[PDB]
C-alpha cells in the first residue's frame, strides 16, 4: 500500500502465454514487472539502470563499464568478493551484465527455490557496493583485457571510428570500454582517486527513479510483490534528470564525407549512413521499420537483387540504427566484390535510385498492413523465452513503455502514418550522407590514425559534382516494390495428439536409404515444426578439394535460393543448409503450414542445380578470403581449432583447403554434384505439429525427389563410418605450439582426456567440472587476473571426453600452464576438506541443470538431435545419469581425480595447445613434454579409440 505507488492493470500478454504478470511503480520511482510461472524450473531477476558509458566523466573513460564489473565483487551485507558468483553456482544459477550508451543491465537465474537468497545478494549491488581497494587494482586488468581482445576486431574498430569522426564535443565520441590507461594509469598521474569517483558516480547516478526491475518465479503475484518491496523500496531516489542528447553528433561539417579505412581482415565493405531524429517516440508507427523493410528487402526487384546482378555486392543490411535519446541513424551497408570496390559511386547511385522509387510511389499501406499482421501472428505464437534473457530484455524496455504495454511494445504496430514515412525518407538525401569504404587496398594510402584502436584511415569531402549526380537519381526500371508475401502462414490448427504417440522420438522408418525419427510435439502446442536431415556421403570430405566443393555447392545453392527464401523467412519459415565432415545438413524450422512447399523447393533445386559462372567466381573469391581471414581470429579460438585438428582421425586444415581451392574449376564442380548426390543415406528427425503419417509423407517426397532428379541409390552399412578420437597414452604429455600473427595476446587449451563416454565416466567428469567450475573462474581470472577469457568444463568429441581449460592472456602459455596446474592441487586440498553438505549442494546444482526442462520446441529438438548425430540415441539420458549421479560419493570423485587428473595420476592423458602472441600459491614440477612437429606424424604415432556403442 505504502511503498507501492501504482499498480499494473492488465499486462497485455499473448493469448498462448500461460505465465501471469503484474506491473508496479514503487514510491521509490522504480518501475517493476513480475512474472508468475508456477511451472518454471529456474527463477530469475534483472535490473536496468538508465545510465551508461555515454555519461562517463570526460577524463575517466569507461567508468560506468568499470563500475558494472565492480558491483560483482562484494557489498556491505555480503562482503566476501565471490559470495555472489559462488551462491549462484552452488544453486544452479548464472549471472552476467552489459553496459551500453544509456543502460547498465544486470541479471541472473537460479533454482526456483533459492530465488529469495539470490535476489537479496543482487539487491545489495544497488544499496552499498564495497569497491574494495585491492579488488579495484585487480579487476581493472579484466577490463583492460576485455579491450585488448577487441583492439584487433574489425567491427569494434569501425564502431569507435564512427564516434571519432563526429563532433568531438558530443558525448558520442567517448571511449566506452576503458582500459588500464584510462581507468588507472592516466588518473594516478592526474591525481585522481578512482575508488572515490566510482563511489561518487554510483551515488550520483544509481538512483531508483532511473531503475527498472523484473522478477520471475514460481511464487504468486502477491508473494512476489511483497518480495520486491521488501528488497528494493529501500533504494534512494536522488531524482536524477534523465540525460537527453538533442544535438546530433553529426552536424553540417560531418556530412558529405568519405572515409577510406584499412581493415585487419581481408574484407571489403561499404557503409552508408544518414543522420536522423530520434524515431523512438513514433514507435507505434515505426516509420523506420517500414523504410528498413523495403530498403533491406532481398526479393525480386529489390536494391540487393540488382546490385547482386551487376555483380557488385553479396549481402545488404538496411534500416534504423539506435544512437541515444535525441538522435538515431539510418544505414545501408553492403559487402563488396572486387568489381564492386571499383564501382562504389555507381552502387551508391543505385541506392538513391531505389530511394527515389519510394518517393515516387509514396507510402504503401498494404505493406504496412502486411507487417502488422505478421507481427500479430509472430506475437501470438512466440516461443516461451528463457527466464534470464527475458527478465533482462524486459527490464530494459520498461524505460520506454507504460507497464501495460511492455510485452507488446516491441512487437505490435498500430497506426500507418504515411506522413512520418515521408518525413524520414526526406532525410535520406545525398547532401545528408556519410560514406565509408573498408579495403586492404588502402594500405599505406591513409594519413590518419584513431587514438583508441589505431585504425588507419583517410577523410575526404565528397566532390560536389558527385553529390549533384546522386541528387538527380532517375528511375531505374529494375527496381520494383515487393509483391504480396505468399508465404504468410494461414493455417494454425494444432492437430490432435495421436493414440500411438510417444514421449520420445520413435524410429518410424528404417530402410537402407532412410532412418527417420519422429515425435509429435506434446509439450508446447504451437503451430510449428522442426525438420532435420543429415545426409551422408563419403565424397563430402574425402579430400580438401572435395570438402571445398561441398561447401561451394551449398553456398551457391543458398545464393540462388535466397530471393525465394527471403519472403519465407519473413513469414517465420526458415532453413539452414550447410556441409558437414560426413555430408550435408538441412533443417527447416517454423510454421508448419507451408513447410512442405519450401522443403520440396530446396530438394528440387538441390538435385537439379545449374551453376551461374559469375556467382561461382565471386563466392569462390570470398571463400578464399574467408579461409585466409582465420589468421586474424583470436588466440583462444586458434588454440581450440588446432586441438580439434590434433584429436580427430581425419580433419583438413585451413591451409590444405586454401591450397586445394585454386583447383576447383567450374566443370570440376558441375561433375562433383551428381557424384555427391548419387549415393546417400538420410537420417532425419521430424519433430513438431505433425502426424506420424505426414512425417512419412515428408520423408517419401524427400527420397522421391532425390531418386527422381539425382538418381540417388542407398549406401552400404559399411560405408557409414564415423571418425575416431586419437588415443593418448597413460602419463603422456604433448604440446603443439603455434603463433598468432595478429593479436598480441596468447591462447591456450589444456585437455585431460579421460575415457569413452559411459553413464559413469560421463558423470564423474560432469561432477568434478561442477565442483571446480566456480573456483576456476575465481582463482585464475578474479584472483590471479590472467585474462578476461578463462574457461573450464567438459570436452566431448567423437564419443570421447575429458577436462579442458581455455585461457587467453598477456602472459605466455608455458606459464598459464603451471598456474592451471597450481589450481588443481588447490582443488584437491579443497575437496579433501570440503564439507559433506557442500558436496550435495553441488550434486544438486548439476541435477537441476541437467533436468532443466526445454522451454521451446527447438531446445527439445536440439536435445534429441544431439542424441541422433552422436549416434547414442539415449533419449532418457538426463533421468538415468542424474539418478546415477546422486549415488556418487565424495571419495568416488577423489579416487577418479587421483587416478585420471592429478599431476602424477597413473592414467593422465594431457595435450596442450599453446598459441603465442604476435611477439614472443605454489605450482608442482612438470615433466618435459613431447613437442608435436607434425600433426599427421603425431596422429599416426598413436592408437584411435573405438566408436561409442548405440544405446
Ligand atoms: Zn566488461
Curated annotation (Swiss-Prot):
Changing residue 487 to A: Strongly increased enzyme activity. Coiled coil: none annotated. GO terms for biological process: amyloid-beta clearance; amyloid-beta clearance by cellular catabolic process; amyloid-beta metabolic process; antigen processing and presentation of endogenous peptide antigen via MHC class I; bradykinin catabolic process; hormone catabolic process; insulin catabolic process; insulin metabolic process. Changing residue 243 to G: Reduced enzyme activity. GO terms for cellular component: basolateral plasma membrane; cell surface; cytoplasm; cytosol; cytosolic proteasome complex; external side of plasma membrane; extracellular exosome; extracellular space. The active site is at residue 68. GO terms for molecular function: amyloid-beta binding; ATP binding; ATP hydrolysis activity; beta-endorphin binding; endopeptidase activity; identical protein binding; insulin binding; metalloendopeptidase activity. It is an enzyme of class 3 (hydrolase). It is found in: Cytoplasm, Cytosol; Cell membrane; Secreted. The modification N6-succinyllysine is found at residues 149, 654. ATP binds at residues 386, 852-858. Binds 1 zinc ion per subunit. The N-terminus is blocked. Belongs to the peptidase M16 family. Plays a role in the cellular breakdown of insulin, APP peptides, IAPP peptides, natriuretic peptides, glucagon, bradykinin, kallidin, and other peptides, and thereby plays a role in intercellular peptide signaling. Substrate binding induces important conformation changes, making it possible to bind and degrade larger substrates, such as insulin. Contributes to the regulation of peptide hormone signaling cascades and regulation of blood glucose homeostasis via its role in the degradation of insulin, glucagon and IAPP. (Microbial infection) The membrane-associated isoform acts as an entry receptor for varicella-zoster virus (VZV). Homodimer. Can also form homotetramers. The SlyX motif may be involved in the non-conventional secretion of the protein. ATP-binding induces a conformation change. PANTHER family: INSULIN-DEGRADING ENZYME-RELATED, NARDILYSIN. This is Insulin-degrading enzyme. The lineage of its organism: Eukaryota, Metazoa, Chordata, Craniata, Vertebrata. The gene is IDE.
Amino acid at each position: 500500500n505504502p511503498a507501492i505507488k501504482r499498480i499494473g492493470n492488465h499486462i497485455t500478454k499473448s493469448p498462448e502465454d500461460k505465465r501471469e504478470y503484474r506491473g508496479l511503480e514503487l514510491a521509490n520511482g522504480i518501475k517493476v514487472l513480475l512474472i508468475s510461472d508456477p511451472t518454471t524450473d529456474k527463477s530469475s531477476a534483472a535490473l536496468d539502470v538508465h545510465i551508461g558509458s555515454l555519461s562517463d566523466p570526460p577524463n575517466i573513460a569507461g567508468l560506468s563499464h568499470f563500475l558494472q564489473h565492480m558491483l560483482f565483487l562484494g557489498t556491505k551485507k555480503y562482503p566476501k568478493e565471490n559470495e555472489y558468483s559462488q551462491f549462484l553456482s552452488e544453486h544452479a544459477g548464472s549471472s552476467n551484465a552489459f553496459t551500453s550508451g544509456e543502460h547498465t543491465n544486470y541479471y541472473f537465474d537460479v533454482s526456483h527455490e533459492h530465488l529469495e537468497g539470490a535476489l537479496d545478494r543482487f539487491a545489495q549491488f544497488f544499496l552499498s557496493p564495497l569497491f574494495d581497494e585491492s579488488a579495484k587494482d585487480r579487476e581493472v586488468n579484466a577490463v583492460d583485457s576485455e579491450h585488448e581482445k577487441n583492439v584487433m576486431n574489425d567491427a569494434w574498430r569501425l564502431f569507435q571510428l564512427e564516434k571519432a569522426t563526429g563532433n568531438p564535443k558530443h558525448p558520442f565520441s567517448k571511449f566506452g570500454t576503458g582500459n588500464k590507461y584510462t581507468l588507472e594509469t592516466r588518473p594516478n598521474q592526474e591525481g585522481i582517486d578512482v575508488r572515490q569517483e566510482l563511489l561518487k558516480f554510483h551515488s550520483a547516478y544509481y538512483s531508483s527513479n532511473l531503475m527498472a526491475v523484473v522478477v520471475l518465479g514460481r511464487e504468486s503475484l502477491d508473494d512476489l510483490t511483497n518480495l520486491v518491496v521488501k528488497l528494493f523500496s529501500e533504494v534512494e531516489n536522488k531524482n536524477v534528470p534523465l540525460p537527453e542528447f538533442p544535438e546530433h553528433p553529426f552536424q553540417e561539417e560531418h556530412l558529405k564525407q568519405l572515409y577510406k579505412i584499412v581493415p585487419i581482415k581481408d574484407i571489403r565493405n561499404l557503409y552508408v549512413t544518414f543522420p536522423i531524429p530520434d524515431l523512438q517516440k513514433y514507435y507505434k508507427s515505426n516509420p523506420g521499420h517500414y523504410l528498413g523493410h523495403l530498403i533491406g528487402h532481398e526479393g525480386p526487384g529489390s536494391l540487393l537483387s540488382e546490385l547482386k546482378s551487376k555483380g557488385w555486392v553479396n549481402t545488404l543490411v538496411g534500416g534504423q540504427k539506435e544512437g541515444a535519446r535525441g538522435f538515431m541513424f539510418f544505414i545501408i551497408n553492403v559487402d563488396l566484390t572486387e568489381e564492386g570496390l571499383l564501382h562504389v559511386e555507381d552502387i551508391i547511385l543505385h541506392m538513391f535510385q531505389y530511394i527515389q522509387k519510394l518517393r515516387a510511389e509514396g507510402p504503401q499501406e498494404w505493406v504496412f498492413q502486411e507487417l502488422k499482421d505478421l507481427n500479430a501472428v509472430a506475437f501470438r505464437f512466440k516461443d516461451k523465452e528463457r527466464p534470464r534473457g527475458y527478465t533482462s530484455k524486459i527490464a530494459g524496455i520498461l524505460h520506454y513503455y507504460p507497464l501495460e504495454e511492455v510485452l507488446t511494445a516491441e512487437y505490435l504496430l498500430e497506426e500507418f502514418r504515411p506522413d512520418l514515412i515521408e518525413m524520414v525518407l526526406d532525410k535520406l538525401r545525398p547532401e545528408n550522407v556519410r560514406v565509408a569504404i573498408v579495403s586492404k587496398s588502402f594500405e599505406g594510402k591513409t594519413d590518419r590514425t584513431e587514438e583508441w584502436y589505431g585504425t588507419q584511415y583517410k577523410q575526404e569531402a565528397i566532390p560536389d559534382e558527385v553529390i549533384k549526380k546522386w541528387q538527380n537519381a532517375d528511375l531505374n526500371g529494375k527496381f520494383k516494390l515487393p509483391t504480396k508475401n505468399e508465404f504468410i502462414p494461414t493455417n494454425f490448427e494444432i492437430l490432435p495428439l495421436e493414440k500411438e504417440a510417444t514421449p520420445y522420438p520413435a524410429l518410424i522408418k528404417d530402410t537402407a536409404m532412410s532412418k527417420l525419427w519422429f515425435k509429435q510435439d506434446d509439450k508446447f502446442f504451437l503451430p510449428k515444426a522442426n525438420l532435420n536431415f543429415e545426409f551422408f556421403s563419403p565424397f563430402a570430405y574425402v579430400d580438401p578439394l572435395h570438402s571445398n566443393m561441398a561447401y561451394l555447392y551449398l553456398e551457391l545453392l543458398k545464393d540462388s535460393l535466397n530471393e525465394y527464401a527471403y519472403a519465407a523467412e519473413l513469414a517465420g519459415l526458415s532453413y539452414d543448409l550447410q556441409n558437414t565432415i560426413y555430408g550435408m545438413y538441412l533443417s527447416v524450422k517454423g510454421y508448419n503450414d507451408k513447410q512442405p512447399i519450401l522443403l520440396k523447393k530446396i530438394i528440387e533445386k538441390m538435385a537439379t542445380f545449374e551453376i551461374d559462372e559469375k556467382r561461382f567466381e565471386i563466392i569462390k573469391e570470398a571463400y578464399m578470403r574467408s579461409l585466409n581471414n582465420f589468421r586474424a581470429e583470436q588466440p583462444h579460438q586458434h588454440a581450440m581449432y588446432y586441438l580439434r585438428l590434433l584429436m580427430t582421425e581425419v580433419a583438413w586444415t585451413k591451409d590444405e583447403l586454401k591450397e586445394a581451392l585454386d583447383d576447383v574449376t567450374l566443370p570440376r564442380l558441375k561433375a562433383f554434384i551428381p557424384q555427391l548426390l548419387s549415393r546417400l543415406h538420410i537420417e532425419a528427425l521430424l519433430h513438431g505439429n505433425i502426424t506420424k503419417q505426414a512425417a512419412l509423407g515428408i520423408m517419401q517426397m524427400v527420397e522421391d525427389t532425390l531418386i527422381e532428379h539425382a538418381h540417388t541409390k542407398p549406401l552400404l552399412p559399411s560405408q557409414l563410418v564415423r571418425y575416431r578420437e586419437v588415443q593418448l597414452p597413460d602419463r603422456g604429455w604433448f604440446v603443439y605450439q603455434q603463433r598468432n600473427e595478429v593479436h598480441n595476446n596468447s591462447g591456450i587449451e589444456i585437455y585431460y582426456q579421460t575415457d569413452m563416454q559411459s553413464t559413469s565416466e560421463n558423470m564423474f567428469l560432469e561432477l568434478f567440472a561442477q565442483i571446480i567450475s566456480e573456483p576456476a573462474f575465481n582463482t585464475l581470472r578474479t584472483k590471479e587476473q590472467l585474462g578476461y577469457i578463462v574457461f573450464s568444463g567438459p570436452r566431448r568429441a567423437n564419443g570421447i571426453q575429458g577436462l579442458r581449460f581455455i585461457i587467453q592472456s598477456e602472459k605466455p602459455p608455458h606459464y598459464l600452464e603451471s598456474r592451471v596446474e597450481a589450481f588443481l592441487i588447490t582443488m584437491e586440498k579443497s575437496i579433501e576438506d570440503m564439507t559433506e553438505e557442500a558436496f550435495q549442494k553441488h550434486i544438486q546444482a548439476l541435477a537441476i541443470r541437467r533436468l532443466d526442462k526445454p522451454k521451446k520446441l527447438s531446445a527439445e529438438s536440439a536435445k534429441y538431435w544431439g542424441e541422433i548425430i552422436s549416434q547414442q540415441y539415449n533419449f532418457d539420458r538426463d533421468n538415468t545419469e542424474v539418478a546415477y549421479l546422486k549415488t556418487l560419493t565424495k571419495e568416488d570423485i577423489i579416487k577418479f581425480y587421483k587416478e585420471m587428473l592429478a599431476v602424477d595420476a597413473p592414467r593422465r592423458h594431457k595435450v596442450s595447445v599453446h598459441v603465442l602472441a604476435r611477439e614472443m600459491s605454489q605450482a608442482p614440477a612438470l615433466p618435459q613434454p613431447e613437442v608435436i612437429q607434425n600433426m599427421t606424424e603425431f596422429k599416426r604415432g598413436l592408437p584411435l579409440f573405438p566408436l561409442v556403442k548405440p544405446h
